[PDB]
Design a protein around this ligand. Structure first.
Ligand SMILES: O=c1ccn([C@@H]2O[C@H](COP(=O)(O)OP(=O)(O)O)[C@@H](O)[C@H]2O)c(=O)[nH]1
Ligand SMILES: O=c1ccn([C@@H]2O[C@H](COP(=O)(O)OP(=O)(O)O)[C@@H](O)[C@H]2O)c(=O)[nH]1
Lengths: 611, 68, 224
């Protein structure tokens, strides 16, 4: 009989010590909180990536008697045993805040058992496995090895109960095996998306008719069947099945055919973020260098909108964003508005660095700044030296170099400020440019919303826009993330943590989650799931308009409100959902022993049903 | 303060293309100049401190004897 | 692979319009290869890093070269953060009177050091940019012919920066006038050069320089 109280945690994912997915981020930022709780009882497990592991992992000698507390002996012997049979791996600390201990199996040292295993899998779970799919080969290899390693631990350790968490289908082959071999560990499977979800939404409808698609056939249609089978097997073998978001859980229920027992929303390391005026000024500096020679609006009366992240035109909702802005243009010309909205699209695309045009811009405007300064400090000295001696200040000299710097701003008649800051390697086929053409947002002075596409991540060392991304976000007025497929959405959530108003959707995981906690707090939620494609767009424009027509004080109200939301998203609060998950896994595994520890019998159908 | 105001004014004009001292500035300038006037025929002191023996100090008395 | 003493290294530079033969780039690269030999044989303690600032057709910076500066800058930050933490801790103890690096700090320090490791046997590049003709460029091919490849054995290192200098560069944060001043010796081995403003302005800025007797400025300088 095992100790449910003081137990062991093994979290397994493909990403552990190598950025390949977004899960890397999740695990890395959840480490500090879970190391804090589990200390050295907690191990992350994953495939060794021989290309990167040396940059991220403090390698340790796992054989020294010192490497493990005595109560933690079993794990050491487990590895010992694993080495015997010829399995190779790296024990080490993952060099993040938290510094959690990590076991990285060398998938090569086991690649032999490949054929034997592909077979065993088929004849225990009926999971096909073509030989040209390297990801699943690796996913099987990883699976068999980890199941194996847990087999050993469950064998050698007899004091601690053992909970083993797996993230996403690639790390999910281990799950069937565990249930089949009746290994003594309670298992949790979280899915951060579904296979069919991604593949359906990659063309341009979903959230409606998804409850009625033939899964076995559509998986086929995409050449995904064997992958789908693993994702499904993973979801049914686990003792507790979860997803990151409310929205994805609905998707999951109908697509994998099991109702998630709970949600495990992604929090952030909020301390790692925590100004706006200071950073807005750096953005002003860019806008002036860009619209040089036709700067016809009041920066004290302009708002900065932005969408950012991975370049997924349809899914991130770039289309709706550009479109809705075109419409917010109309409305602001008709409503004859005094204000101006400059809107950035920071999304990385194939490029050849900066446009000559865009670089001259900033250069000449900077030379103006110098000259003005030189000139003024000359006036300074002259004014002072007169006063101190008691008993047109611009000499010709200064007028000349001033006049020259002003003349350098003139731009070739009828040439407008560019809509793009880079040399696009496909100016004709790029989705973002072509939509901002279709809507004819070209930055002419008549246009009340200006359009800036910066196909490149942000770094403080840029000739054009001298900020890091965090700096830039803070300097803006409103983030806009009209996402159509987005299981969580770190971009909006980190937008919020940084104290910036933002617009998300109700098909966003982060949207979904946020909904349950209205707009006064700096979070607008566009309905993308129930209203039709157009009403969605319109709802978007209404939200933007409302924001534009906010008074200086109405805006400082919101901003101060969103800024307090931040602490809601730290792991210190979001982590408690993982505890609900793990503990539900225990209550389901040892129904009897659990009753003893609690003093009654609690419900075991959800994680919320439990606590 | 005054010059950096001129600065902003000069620049903002140029960036928009197509007596810089307003009254406001002239006033506080004039006042600061007037505060330098010193009481007729009063010279710059030969000493920076309150001497505790202004009459007997060797250094002051020599620089008096020589009338510097 | 930073194996030499900056307190004991000299910076040489040639600069200007890209005229391989006429500016005397050839002689420069060649003479440096030879200055390498002599410094290995003479077993010298010193190191010469030599810049060719001559504009060529390019596609901005190499990913390699940019990662370089980035990681090394992140080291600087992290060190700073860490040290000022030590500062506060040391002071606060003293003011109250009657391993300073916590685990926390050791980790992010260790990570920043690990990010510097470069793929085995990969040497420091001889070029900072994406060359639009890597095979036909006169300057690269000569510095290949002489096999100055920046291996630690080599006592003169070779840096080709096919782009004028601007203070706003991710790689080399100087204007040209700034850069010139920061160097130790300009080298302008010109073959056809009716005046040569590069060397003459090199001299005006108070930097030692080598010109020729077929340079106009050389010619003129000789009579003094
Ligand atoms: O210039 C940039 C743009 C974005 N990001 C980061 O990239 C991520 C973009 O999120 P992504 O779209 O890849 O994932 P998701 O939005 O679905 O969570 C954000 O978390 C930012 O931290 C960055 O570092 N620099
Ligand atoms: O990074 C650089 C390098 C060159 N120069 C200038 O560009 C000119 C190029 O030199 P060139 O050889 O063409 O002049 P020359 O010596 O032949 O008269 C020099 O005068 C420098 O002032 C510059 O501004 N930035």
């Amino acid at each position: 009989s095992r100790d449910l109280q003081n137990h062991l945690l093994f979290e397994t994912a493909t990403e552990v010590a190598n950025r390949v997915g977004g899960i890397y981020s999740v695990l890395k930022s959840k480490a500090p909180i879970t190391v804090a709780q589990y200390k050295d009882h907690y191990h992350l497990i994953g495939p060794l990536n021989k290309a990167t592991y040396q940059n991220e992992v403090d390698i340790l000698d796992w054989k020294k008697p010192e490497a493990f507390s005595d109560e933690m002996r079993p794990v050491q012997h487990a590895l010992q045993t694993m080495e015997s049979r010829g399995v190779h791996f790296v024990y080490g600390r993952w060099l993040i805040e938290g510094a959690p201990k990590v076991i990285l199996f060398d998938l090569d040292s086991v690649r032999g058992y490949s054929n034997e295993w592909k077979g065993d899998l088929w004849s225990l779970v009926g999971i096909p496995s073509p030989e040209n799919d390297f990801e699943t080969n690796d996913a099987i290899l990883l699976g068999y090895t980890v199941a194996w390693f847990l087999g050993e631990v469950a064998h050698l350790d007899s004091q601690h109960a053992i909970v083993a968490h797996f993230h996403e289908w690639l790390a999910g082959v281990a799950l069937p095996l565990c249930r089949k071999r009746r290994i003594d560990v309670v298992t949790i499977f979280t899915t951060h998306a579904t296979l069919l979800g991604r593949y359906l939404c990659a063309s341009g409808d979903f959230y409606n008719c998804l409850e009625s698609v033939d899964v076995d056939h559509e998986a086929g249609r995409f050449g995904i069947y064997h992958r789908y089978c693993i994702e499904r097997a993973a979801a049914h073998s686990a003792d507790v099945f979860t997803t990151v978001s409310q929205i994805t859980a609905f998707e999951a229920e109908h697509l994998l055919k099991r109702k998630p027992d709970g949600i495990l929303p992604n929090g952030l390391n909020v301390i790692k973020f925590q100004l706006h005026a200071l950073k807005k000024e750096k953005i002003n500096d860019f806008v002036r260098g860009h619209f040089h020679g036709c700067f016809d609006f009041d920066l004290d009366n302009t708002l900065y909108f932005f969408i950012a992240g991975r370049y997924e035109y349809k899914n991130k909702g770039a289309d709706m964003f550009i479109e809705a802005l075109a419409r917010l243009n109309y409305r602001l010309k008709v409503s004859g508005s005094k204000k101006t909205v400059v809107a950035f699209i920071v999304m990385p695309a194939k490029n050849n660095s900066f446009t000559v045009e865009a670089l001259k811009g900033q250069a000449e405007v900077r030379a103006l700044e110098n000259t003005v300064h030189e000139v003024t400090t000359s006036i300074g000295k002259r004014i002072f030296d007169h006063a101190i001696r008691y008993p047109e200040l611009l000499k010709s000299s200064d007028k000349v170099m001033l006049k020259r710097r002003i003349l350098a701003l003139r731009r070739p008649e009828g040439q407008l400020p560019p809509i793009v800051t880079h040399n696009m390697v496909d100016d004709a086929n790029d989705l973002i440019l072509n939509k901002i053409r279709q809507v004819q947002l070209f930055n002419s002075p008549s246009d009340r919303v200006k359009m800036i596409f910066h196909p490149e991540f942000l770094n403080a060392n840029n000739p054009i826009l001298g900020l890091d991304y965090d700096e830039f976000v803070r300097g803006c007025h409103l983030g806009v993330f009209p996402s159509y497929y987005e299981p969580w959405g770190y971009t909006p959530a980190e937008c919020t943590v940084m104290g910036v108003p933002s617009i998300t959707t109700n098909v966003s995981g982060f949207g979904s989650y946020m909904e349950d906690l209205a707009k006064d707090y700096g979070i607008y939620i566009v309905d993308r799931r129930f209203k039709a494609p157009d009403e969605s767009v319109e709802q978007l424009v209404d939200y933007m308009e409302e924001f534009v027509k906010k008074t200086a004080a109405q805006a400082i109200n919101q901003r101060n409100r969103t800024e307090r939301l931040s602490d809601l998203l730290d792991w210190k609060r979001m982590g408690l959902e993982y505890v609900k998950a793990r503990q539900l896994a225990l209550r389901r595994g040892y129904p009897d022993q659990f009753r003893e520890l609690v003093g009654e019998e609690l419900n075991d159908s959800n994680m919320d049903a439990l606590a």
